Amino acid sequence: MPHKEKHPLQDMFTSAIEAVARDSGWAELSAVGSYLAKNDPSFDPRNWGHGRLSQMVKKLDFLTVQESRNGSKLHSEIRLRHDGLEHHHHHH
């Protein structure tokens, strides 16, 4: 009886960001991990290493990554690109 789960990363991150987007437009990376942990217990951020979670989404082009200035610590943030998928380029 899994809740949400969503195999697609795009939809999975989109649902988590929109769920905590009430904080202030963007979403704190820490809030996303906790949200996915509760909403998706099968989510194990430990496997992706701690802190390295921000670098994990960085390898995803369809996701914009920015660091907000939260107090003396820098918090990572993610957003779902408004543009749809696009990689045809001149080649393909």
DSSP line for the chain: ---S--SSHHHHHHHHHHHHTTTBSB-BHHHHHHHHHHH-TT--TTTT-SSHHHHHHHT-TTEEEEEEEETTEEEEEEEE-SS-----TTT-
Number of Cβ within 10 Å of residue 16's Cβ equals 23
Phi, psi (rounded to 5 degrees) for 26 = -55, -175
Name the class of domain 11-83.
alpha beta
Q: Domain extents for the chain?
A: 11-83
Q: How was this structure determined?
A: NMR
